[PDB]
Design an enzyme around this catalytic site. Structure first.
Site, PDB file in Angstrom:
ATOM      1  N   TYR D 119      -3.572  -4.742   1.568  1.00  0.00           N
ATOM      2  CA  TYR D 119      -2.232  -5.326   1.780  1.00  0.00           C
ATOM      3  C   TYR D 119      -1.377  -4.698   2.892  1.00  0.00           C
ATOM      4  O   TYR D 119      -0.441  -5.338   3.372  1.00  0.00           O
ATOM      5  CB  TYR D 119      -1.451  -5.308   0.462  1.00  0.00           C
ATOM      6  N   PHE D 390       3.096 -10.264 -11.743  1.00  0.00           N
ATOM      7  CA  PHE D 390       2.967 -11.691 -11.423  1.00  0.00           C
ATOM      8  C   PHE D 390       1.844 -11.909 -10.409  1.00  0.00           C
ATOM      9  O   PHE D 390       1.093 -12.875 -10.537  1.00  0.00           O
ATOM     10  CB  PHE D 390       4.287 -12.264 -10.888  1.00  0.00           C
TER      11      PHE D 390
END
Ligand code: COA
Ligand code: COA
Ligand code: COA
EC number: 2.3.1.-
Lengths: 392, 4, 392, 390, 394, 4
Positions: D119, D390
């Protein structure tokens, strides 16, 4: 008393099964497999009354070298109650069935073993080798020489693509020695295993190729392991492409599979050692019923020269054997033996898993001529590597 | 994987 | 700068060794092994000053099939400092040594690997297989067919019977493919390992037979395990008798050994499965230096018919090959190749551990004629099973 | 290849999800989670056909220092099929969503990572820190200074007291940096999980100013995993831990919390609260640099200072900070501070000090006083916490 | 049972008590070296009546504190009560006497390393530093493009005993510029460089990675042959820190590298994957007890960033002190004026080096105060610019 | 068992 079970005896048999086999598929599943058992292909021992011992064979089709397909009696479901143990029940049951197997004209009979020390005495020898490879897929980089350096492999739900797996497997079993016909009832049960179980096994996924497929799922305890239950590959392209996909599972740390000693996966990678062999065990066990029918039907190596001999099976007669141009003629004889072995030792030799020199070194098959020993190794060696189809 |  | 080390460079080399190898035998031990290194058989890389990279080969004698003994450069002691890593030092060092190996007329060069992914690029292929068998000796009952159903085996202190182990091993290595000459300095060190270490390894015992011996000791953590470090057997009688004795160790639960895939011990027992294979790994690695000298010197199977072909080594020329009556003639050529392979792939084939069909299935050796593929398997197959002598 | 998914593509996406994620919530649950994904918030890659690549963002509301609430694009459900990996599919999907997220007007985007190494290149930096404490509760004795030494905490079934957890959480998330709004469909899915061959029954410790959701572990029957502890007052936090340490059945209590959790100091032995596990939590990509910096609150303690900040491929700005506010306006003037886009993400919530990043050369500056001032300014008054995955 | 300072005859009995009470007991030979650091009347013993059944002592240490200021410190250690004489009052009596002497000797602070975290709070000791074990799986470790020194490397692999002078110079520089840093006298360097050799079936051989401005002592774990334990990583510059970690990560033999370091170690941010630097263990390191509050608080450096502010501070049973922090320094004298801030003596210990924030302690109610603006200013002021480290266990 |  020993006899063929009626319909009423099946409830009892399933109880014995449940008490004997921890991996007992269950009453409803077993009813599917019971269609493979032929008329009078199962025996029970009643207590004078409840059932206290059982055994049966199923009607299988084993592929042997040279792509030839023999009928095979698949010994299974063999148990003796803990209350009637060490009483002669297994011996009486394993004979009789062998009488029925031999009377029905099965050249061979086969089984999978729960312990390796029970079956040798009844003439069963280890015929295939199981071989668990575990790959750490974070380090697994493929060789430049590996095929395929768009992708033809697809990730699918196994139940949605039944027919493609049948066609692929049907191809597979016919060309690979140790392959078994998988009838419709066994596919019914295999695709039923793919569904997500309630608080047990996870959901199964499939990698599908035109020439092959892999069935796999994530392990329940080790979430970073993917257990490949079944990889069927007809071409080397499929084999490579399926493992490229499996090693592409970025979620996992490790991919494990139960395959055969000559699986080419270590040579597909840069580091051969990354495909660690974690577990070895005997797979399929063979008892040759009709020695000349079994040996004649089998293919042999063209490469080795023509040669003749006389082979003795310990309490199983004595046979002239002439091998040449990749085929054998085998007939009964009273002539003296040049080679001697117990019936199980021929089983191990038959698919070409075990060398005759290794067996001779253990004095399990005796012979004087050393040149005749080397010719058995070469002759009984299999061109296509031997694989184990499925447990039964 | 099956039966016994 | 890259050069041959002087006497002064050895202190430095031992530091690098100690930092690189956790199993580093030590400064005084290594001085014994340094007698096996020939003049200009070792290279160092200095920092413009301290040593930051090293490598060397020893003068070994490898037995190959047909009981023929080739000179072999034993690559060892190869390290690069963590400070000078990924800088070209290994590549520059592994060339040069190969220049010196080839200039001294070694047909082959060999090593044992610390990782399986480093050595393939330099033309080294896995030539032998290590195979740990672990036996639960409480259940191990021998087969009726096993030899020897007075005892000729003796329990002795290994140091007191040096000369008998030499004579036995000298016999062993000459007949078994993969065998190595064990010079006097290596016996000095082996018998020095037998003594009880201060708070580490336990005392070693020996089982001695006229045709064989076993060196073993109880494991430091697992007191119920006996680790057999070395079993040398010239006859099947010795092999059986030594294992009868080992299984007679009523103290132990388990006996483990690092042996070869065709060790006949499972067939010696009633239950084949009791000799569980617990660990598989590549043992000896081979780089064929002189292709025709290596192939001509090797023995081949009489059984396979006469056949001719042309073999290409990837960046290693191209060679006519005619094999027949168990011997080969191999000469350089510019004629087109029927078979193509990287230099390491020939290594794996050479002692007969790995089949050419398995390697071809991985596309590591390419060939069009399938009949020529089957003839390579048969030809390069070894009569005597391949074993791994000792690490270096 | 790359296009927004239609209604027929979702069956394909869940197959990709279940193959890519072992902790896959399932089709029924993922349909509830999908109500938070806006029109044109998802992308798929089809093979040309079957879906072989996916990604989406959810409409979240992230709370930042100074109790300010920001619209936030919640990246999740990102997956590339194992057949089509190492093929530019992820790079293509991520750039398109960041185009959409930017053009839509989100100042920040956020995600939870499956691996830490993927990321950093896409502009995402670790914002919060997860921190597992494990207390051996047999030896746990509270300090004499511990607040509240009849009890106001009740032991309850979680499904019976939904409104109270909503109220307590709504209070909590609004006042804590890292707090996320929790809409009705995520309360539905949270209270679906409470009921019990796998996970054991979840119980609740309810206070007026806090709650604790816990359950006994399936394997270790002497361990209680506190899945979620939300406390508004210190009185609530302590009252909840006294009750947790009250559990006679258990030997150990464990929780995934934040580095500045006051539980160790509540006990007479600080060492009894063993920090077993540490990991990054929420990751942040600042989409709009000026919008994000000006919306944030800063430390009043630091005296006024003005500098020029460059983000590697994200503009150069005149950064004036003072009186707990920032002005961030365009400029071409010589840069005083330089960093990659992810480095700012990690600074933003105040978890990582600029000194620590500067020591690893992730942000360059030749003025050391400006370095000290950045630490002080970007530090969050309230400690940084992690809302929910999430 | 009478308390008294030990004579030369009592040490054999102390070592018996040591060996029974400390599994990691360095031994008699080593303890005689460490004993050079124990000043005249630094130790006390308790006898039954005869034999020694309780002991305690302190060493003459020098602790670096924020603003690079070096305070004399009483290093409490060797503290033990016989198992036959527990729950009696012996430890209380011994620790009461030592603290009396430390006060008369003029130490501003006393310090120790814990064996349990629940014994030392009631004697005024609070955890001041924090120990932090990172574990990098070096097979997956790849350095970020931004990381320094990405030509010939300046790091060298060396035998630790062959380069003593170089490790002393680096450490002497390190400890002076880093909070939590301790002076390492010659006798400890003797014992540290005696440990680095190979032991008979025990600890494996230690090696070193040497830089001009940094060094790293490491050795392979006796049980895990694929793990290198970094015992000690001292680095002055950021270049030295990265260079040393590139070398460590260059250990192709090893799978994992572990180290006991501090929470603000920039290692994770040196890699492309921060998550690879897994914090596998977290524990309290050095414990502090403020002896003289004015000498301690005034001698420390504070944050320039916060503005000037004044307050009144009470230590629970240790008087009351007016405080005025501003422009880096602070003024602190005793007073009778009403307290604005209250705390127990150990809570001041924890704040002092700056590991723990006052907000955290306040949220727990360990320090009380009504003005929340004063609470925010305490954090800012007592926070250290240079991160706090842990020098060596004693 | 030896050397490297
Ligand atoms: O009755 P029984 O004990 O079972 O066997 P029997 O008594 O008939 O006799 C057989 C002999 O084998 C032995 N034996 C019998 N059963 C045995 C057993 N189960 N195990 C080991 N040995 C046995 C007995 O010793 C017996 O006697 P013998 O060896 O002395 O001849 N899947 C996902 C896809 S999506
Ligand atoms: O220096 P080096 O890094 O060691 O190697 P070099 O730099 O010389 O180069 C060799 C290549 O192999 C790889 N490589 C080198 N060393 C390697 C290593 N140790 N491990 C894995 N890969 C390596 C490198 O990637 C390098 O580059 P390339 O693969 O891109 O060509 N006993 C009892 C009896 S009683
Ligand atoms: O493989 P892939 O998922 O298709 O990834 P891509 O090829 O698009 O590249 C992205 C990277 O992520 C991951 C891979 O390591 C890859 O590295 P690369 O950028 O050096 O190729 C979630 C982030 S928004």
């Amino acid at each position: 008393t020993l006899c063929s079970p009626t319909e009423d005896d099946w409830p009892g048999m399933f109880l014995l099964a449940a008490a004997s086999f921890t991996d007992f598929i269950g009453p409803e599943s077993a009813t599917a497999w019971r269609t493979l058992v032929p008329t009078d292909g199962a025996v029970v021992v009643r207590d004078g009354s409840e059932v206290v011992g059982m055994a049966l064979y199923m009607d299988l089709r084993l592929t042997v070298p040279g792509e030839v397909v023999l009928p095979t009696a698949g010994l299974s479901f063999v148990a003796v109650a803990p209350t009637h143990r060490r009483r002669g029940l297994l011996r009486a049951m394993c004979a009789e069935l062998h009488r029925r197997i031999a009377d029905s004209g099965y050249p061979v009979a086969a089984l999978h073993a729960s312990e390796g020390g029970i079956y040798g005495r009844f003439g069963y020898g280890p015929a295939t080798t199981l071989h668990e490879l575990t790959v750490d897929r974070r380090f697994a980089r493929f060789h430049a020489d590996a095929p395929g350096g768009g992708s033809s492999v697809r990730l699918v739900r196994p139940t949605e693509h039944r027919g493609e797996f049948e066609a692929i497997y049907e191809r597979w079993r016919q060309q690979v020695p140790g392959g078994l016909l998988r009838p419709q009832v066994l596919w019914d049960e295999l695709l039923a295993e793919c569904k997500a179980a309630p608080g047990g096994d996870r959901e199964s996924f499939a990698l599908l190729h035109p020439d092959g497929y892999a069935l796999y799922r994530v392990d329940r305890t080790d979430l970073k392991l993917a257990r490949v239950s079944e990889l069927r590959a007809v071409t080397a392209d499929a084999h490579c492409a399926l493992w490229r996909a499996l090693i592409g599972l970025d979620s996992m740390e490790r991919i494990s599979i139960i395959t055969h000693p000559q699986d080419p996966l270590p040579h597909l990678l840069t580091d051969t050692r990354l495909a660690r062999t974690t577990w070895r065990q005997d797979g399929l066990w063979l008892r040759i019923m009709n020695v000349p029918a079994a040996l004649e039907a089998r293919g042999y190596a063209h490469e080795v020269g023509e040669f003749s001999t006389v082979l003795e099976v310990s309490d199983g007669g004595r046979f002239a054997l002439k091998i040449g141009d990749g085929r054998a003629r085998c007939t009964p004889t009273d002539a003296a033996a040049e080679i001697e072995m117990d019936r199980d030792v021929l089983g191990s030799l038959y698919l070409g898993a075990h060398r005759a020199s290794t067996l001779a070194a253990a004095n399990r098959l005796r012979t004087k001529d050393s040149q005749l020993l080397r010719r058995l190794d070469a002759a009984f060696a299999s061109d296509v590597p031997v694989q184990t189809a499925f447990e039964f | 994987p099956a039966k016994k």
